[PDB]
Amino acid sequence: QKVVEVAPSVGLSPTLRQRICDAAIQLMENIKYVNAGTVEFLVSGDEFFFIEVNPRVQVEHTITEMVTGIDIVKTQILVAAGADLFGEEINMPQQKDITTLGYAIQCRITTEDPLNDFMPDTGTIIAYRSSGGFGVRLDAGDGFQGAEISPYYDSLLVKLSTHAISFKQAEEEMVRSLREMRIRGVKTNIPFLINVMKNKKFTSGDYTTKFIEETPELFDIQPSLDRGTKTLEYIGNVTINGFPNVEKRPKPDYELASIPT
Amino acid sequence: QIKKLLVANRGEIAIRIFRAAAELDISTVAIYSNEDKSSLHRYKADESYLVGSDLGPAESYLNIERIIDVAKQANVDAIHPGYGFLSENEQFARRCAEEGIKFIGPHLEHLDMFGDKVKARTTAIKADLPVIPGTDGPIKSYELAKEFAEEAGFPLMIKATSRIVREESELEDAFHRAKSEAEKSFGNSEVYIERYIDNPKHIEVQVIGDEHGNIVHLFERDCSVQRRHQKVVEVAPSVGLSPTLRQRICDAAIQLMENIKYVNAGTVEFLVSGDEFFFIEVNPRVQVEHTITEMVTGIDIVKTQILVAAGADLFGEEINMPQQKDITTLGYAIQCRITTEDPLNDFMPDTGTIIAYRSSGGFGVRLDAGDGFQGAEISPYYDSLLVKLSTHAISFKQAEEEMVRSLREMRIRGVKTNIPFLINVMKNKKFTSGDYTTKFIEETPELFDIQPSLDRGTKTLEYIGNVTINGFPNVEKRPKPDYELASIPT
Amino acid sequence: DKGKRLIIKLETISEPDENGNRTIYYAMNGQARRIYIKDEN
Amino acid sequence: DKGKRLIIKLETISEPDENGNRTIYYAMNGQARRIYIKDEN
Ligand SMILES: Nc1ncnc2c1ncn2[C@@H]1O[C@H](COP(=O)(O)OP(=O)(O)O)[C@@H](O)[C@H]1O
16 A cells, blocks of 8 residues: 655656656557646566556546646646646646756655554544645545544645755755644654654665565654643643542642752 | 754644654753743754753853853864844854864855945845845944935835835934834944845845865745745745746846855845846844745755755765756746735734644645644734645646645644635636736735634534533533434334 | 534533633533623623 | 743633533733633532
8 A cells, every 4th residue: 555655756766767657658649638636656676567547537636736836736736627738727838848946755644553563543633733935745544633543544634745956955854843733642654654654764765565565664753752741631630639648739839939050 | 974953943844853853863961941941943953951940041142151151061072053033143153163173064254245235245246146225334423314315216214224105205213213223133333225126026045065065056045925924925936037047046046145155054145136136134043934945856955954064065975966067957846825914904923732733745745743643732922824825837827826725734722823814815717827926915905805704613512512611591400311222113 | 504513512501700701611613612701690 | 931831821711511510711922712621529
């Protein structure tokens, strides 16, 4: 299953790209495709092999919007309303003028507790803070404050995507964002995604599908360190179940102390 | 050479720097006044320190010595001033360097050059840039009204070196106000009159220089929509500027800066009427609205500032700037600041606790956090800025739309905001066209056709509430009795 | 209206304050909310 | 630590639910933050 999606591929030759595209325009031309669609492929060195078509939009479309500045979903809608691709509403540039400025990365913040083997955790979200700033894009899913996550659906709290002239910058930003988000009440895959994002093998660029299975220390985790989280557990235990050997009373009103230093 | 960095500022721009620095693996340090005790930017760095248990919040972020003191205490390699406190102040930059700290900025001589409106007048002319004709120096010695009179051209003005004045001796006698104004808010207190250039577009250019002599510009921001003093909305690049006009301004921008060997990011401000342009000022620093420029170029302006301060070269593997002809805009982007300036009531900053808070997101949308989050208390002490919102699309129409709809989808409760006002602006035929000038707000009275919107929800919450606490008439006041279900056939 | 409904949950009412104004904690459509109501002891 | 430090503010507590847990409404470092506690009475 897809964990992290980069566009455009930082590992393709100028020419492979051209062919892998050239091909897609001819399959879809041939069968006169309309609206949006993903022809999946498989590359191995210099030759590549058609695998799949997805007659629809894909989760990871945002990546492609960031690097080209086209609104795929909006066009989808405009296209259905019967509208010249090159006309007014869509203003889509001609083939020879579409380009990809910079690099862009995506990943889905889910509730797959990578410590209970990726079982999607369930329950009530008791704190939710995401991020932003320079080329960061958040598409909301199920995650809000007080949100209620159930067994019944493929869990996805936030789609997070980042972009930048340089693939390292787009990486440096995604990782920053992951370390900033604080999602409480539920376990998430954030620690695992951080680990992918920070790996030599990933940030390098040459990686195959065997990337993950061939990398043990992605699953190296210590269950998150909390100075701030455990302490609240205390301050609101004593407040209600007391403290063994002190007058149950309310916190008495104490003299202000003056503390020479 | 920069392992750890302090930000001599507060709010959104602190939070922006912390994030740049974060991404460079640089560790981050924040300062705060007594009144910023619970302010978001404090929590967004690694370390944070109070400035003075005893220093008025007014003056807590301008105390050169204590800031540097707090800096030395913590092996800070660099301070980023941000904007609008100690950001344009040579004394601070001087005192930084001496204590072995790297002021992330241009050179002392670029600060002194530009700190004065007169110093920066000469500079502009002596680099062959157009200038607004005005009192050749400032004036002091009084009756300083009666003189420059009838010798330049009809439209005039009194500005005050860092009011209209249409004459008829409305000069000596609108020369009563000056004792409490350019003494307290401005730097060195001085005053000099200028030809009033009517109906001007306000266009500024973003520039960046490394310490190796390479400068580039990142095109122009259109800062024309403003309400009196201050900027309301910025658009980049200027939707309503001709291809050549945009060049000449961009060429001048870079003629001034190439000419006095500028370094780091600064901004050249111009005033634009028909086909003539004029030099207003330079801003030797990042501006609030730089976000706009990052969006249409792709360059990270703040990350770059830091890296230039560390001696990186523009064209090197680490800042990685395109040669100029490769720097391009792609689409249009727009910015506006969600503040608590209440539109209905003479735009007071408003003051309170935010109870509910919700932003936007998706395509085209970028939020730079400020003072505002669910928990927060907003105070009367610094300029209210809850969130910076910027949007971006290939087309300016798509851009703006994208903006109204995330202005509308937003939800901030507990304080009043400028959202109703901002929405009216984004919506307006005049703005949508792109052709607008700086009198856009003067000329549009519809813009203040704010009306307090109905909301079925809040009202309902306020009834239920009443009845729950203080019950309903004739009805035996008692907890809501538990009733039988009984299903409604249909 | 048709397909527009309010889902409202009352979480708590606080204890009255200096001048008898209780604080209702609601949730209403995936949104935390706070209303202020005059008590009459 | 030196220059780190928590800031906690307690808003209210809710009367227990059916599992006898109470809701604390906290604010810690500028995020609203709620925690559950089983009462012992
Ligand atoms: N001589 C002038 N003629 C016409 N418009 C002007 C003139 N001087 C300033 N303005 C306008 O008024 C605004 C305020 O002036 P400015 O000196 O730039 O203030 P600030 O230093 O706060 O930016 C400017 O943004 C510009 O649009």
